[PDB]
Amino acid sequence: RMKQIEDKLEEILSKLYHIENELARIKKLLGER
Amino acid sequence: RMKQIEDKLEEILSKLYHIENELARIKKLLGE
Amino acid sequence: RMKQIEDKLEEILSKLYHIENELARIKKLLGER
Amino acid sequence: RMKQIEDKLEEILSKLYHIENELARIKKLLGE
């Protein structure tokens, strides 16, 4: 359960990095536009 | 109270997947 | 601590709704563009 | 292990605030 809570925390963090990156790419694409 | 936390975690993850869908639509709108 | 964990969960959820909404507005603005 | 969870929660919140900053920049780029 705690191990499960832990995996989910990390999964949440990983998606968050993915999201940041996606918005960062958008931002860049628009800034050079 | 661990399960209730794990439960919230699940919900939060689902929001993130919904966000990723919004981003996919957006990126297509922007021609990327 | 558990009450603190709880407030943070909810705060996280609230920002997530805000974010969804912001992306939803963007999407709409671009779709009508 | 509660604090370690609370700790992760803090980190996650900070990412969300960074995201909100990226969104502010984006919305200005789009003239909104």
CB B30 within 8 A of CB C31: no
For residue B27, CA distances in Å to B30, B32, C23 come to 5, 5, 11
Within 8 A of D12 by CB-CB distance, chain A residues are 9, 12-13, 16
Helix ranges, chain A (H) = 2-31
Q: Any chain A CB within 8 A of the CB of B20?
A: yes
CB A13 within 8 A of CB D12: yes
Q: Any chain C CB within 8 A of the CB of D7?
A: no
Please enumerate, as own/partner, the contacts of B1-4 that have beta carbons within 8 Å and a separation of 24 or more.
B1/C2, B2/A1, B2/A2, B2/A5, B3/A1
- Cα separation, D32 vs D30, in Å, equals 6
> How far, in whole angstroms, is CA C19 from its chain's centroid?
4
CA D15-D18-D22 angle, to 5 degrees, is: 135
CB B19 within 8 A of CB C21: no
What percent of chain B is helix, strand and coil (3-state, nearest 5)?
A: 90, 0, 10
- Cα separation, C30 vs D22, in Å, equals 17
Name which of A16, A23, A33 is nearest D12 (Cβ-Cβ): A16
- Looking at residue A22, its amino acid is E
Report resolution in angstroms: 2.0
If one counts the domains in chain D, the total is 1
In the three-class reduction of DSSP (H, G, I as helix; E, B as strand; rest coil), residue B32 is classed as: coil
Place of tokens 């999407």: C27
- Cα separation, B2 vs B30, in Å, equals 42
In sequence order, what are the residues at sequence separation of 6 or more whose Cβ sits closer than 8 angstroms to the Cβ of residue B27?
A: A22, A26
Q: Any chain C CB within 8 A of the CB of D5?
A: yes
Range of the structural domain that residue D24 is part of: 1-32
